[PDB]
A paper describes a structure:
Methylation catalysed by catechol-O-methyltransferase ([name]) is the main pathway of catechol neurotransmitter deactivation in the prefrontal cortex. [name] is a single-domain Mg2+-dependent methyltransferase that catalyses the transfer of an activated methyl group from S-adenosylmethionine (SAM) to its catechol substrate. The crystal structure of [name] comprises a central β-sheet flanked by α-helices, constructing a bipartite active site that accommodates the methyl donor SAM (in the so-called adenine site) and that can also complex an Mg2+ ion to which the catechol substrates bind. Here, a set of apo, semi-holo, holo and Michaelis form crystal structures are described that define the conformational space available to [name] and that include likely intermediates along the catalytic pathway.
We have determined such structures for rat [name] in a variety of conditions and crystal forms. Water replaces Mg2+ and is contacted by Asp184 and Asp212. The β5/α9 loop has now swung out to its maximum extent. In the open state neither the adenine site nor the Mg2+ site are formed. Residues His185, Trp186 and Arg189 stack on top of each other, with Trp186 occupying the usual position of the adenine base. In the absence of a ribose, Glu133 hydrogen-bonds to the indole N atom of Trp186. The different sequences, crystallization conditions and crystal settings all indicate that this form is a recurring state of apo [name].
Author numbering: 45 to 257
The structure:
């Protein structure tokens, strides 16, 4: 335990109930808040993520970007039996911590972690990972990857009419390249979400882009 992601997991093991996803989600939040890393992700990012999942009930979700596994736990706990979450992460440390988090949550059954580059794995999804089309895409942590990844998922025919793309940390004026694309193009129907919590400043911003075929 030297890295931040290692400390998050250390804090989870020492405080969260093993096999209880909510206890885990709460432990990550409590720790990230006291150490002033992420203010209140559980109600900022979390509630938006939950609402999107309950609204669309996706059978196949692809997460592009992972750090400590919060998003993976938050998403997996709401999936239906038969539903699966494919998480792609380039960093082997972030990919490892995420696996351990899911393992601790008792959700590894519902998640498949793919350690490698999005640019290389996305074109392999159809044959190598038995994927026809994605019902949902979750874009996380790496803002400069949102646009090329979206463009790639389109090139690869992984999106269909109704595919939901949910991008995190899409806060004004950051990540404008991706925004100009989805908002601009008649191929996406967009909804922005700005979580303020009890404060007057955007704690978290999220873009929901529904593909129209
Ligand atoms: K649009």
């Amino acid at each position: 335990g030297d890295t931040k992601e290692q400390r998050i997991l250390r804090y989870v093991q020492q405080n969260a109930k093993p096999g209880d996803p909510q206890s885990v989600l709460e432990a990550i939040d409590t720790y990230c808040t006291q150490k002033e890393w992420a203010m209140n992700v559980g109600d900022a990012k979390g509630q938006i993520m939950d609402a999107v999942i309950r609204e669309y009930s996706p059978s196949l979700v692809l997460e592009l970007g992972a750090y400590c596994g919060y998003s993976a736990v938050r998403m997996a706990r709401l999936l239906q039996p038969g539903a699966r979450l494919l998480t792609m992460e380039m960093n082997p440390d972030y990919a490892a911590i995420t696996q351990q988090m899911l393992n601790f949550a008792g959700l590894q059954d519902k998640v498949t972690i793919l350690n490698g580059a999005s640019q290389d794995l996305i074109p392999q999804l159809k044959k190598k990972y038995d994927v026809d089309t994605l019902d949902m895409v979750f874009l996380d942590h790496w803002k400069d990857r949102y646009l090329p990844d979206t463009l790639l998922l389109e090139k690869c025919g992984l999106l269909r009419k109704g595919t939901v793309l949910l991008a995190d940390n899409v806060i004004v004026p950051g990540t404008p390249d991706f925004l100009a694309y989805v908002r601009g193009s008649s191929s996406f129907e967009c909804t922005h979400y700005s979580s303020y919590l009890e404060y007057m400043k955007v704690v978290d911003g999220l873009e929901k882009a529904i593909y129209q075929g």
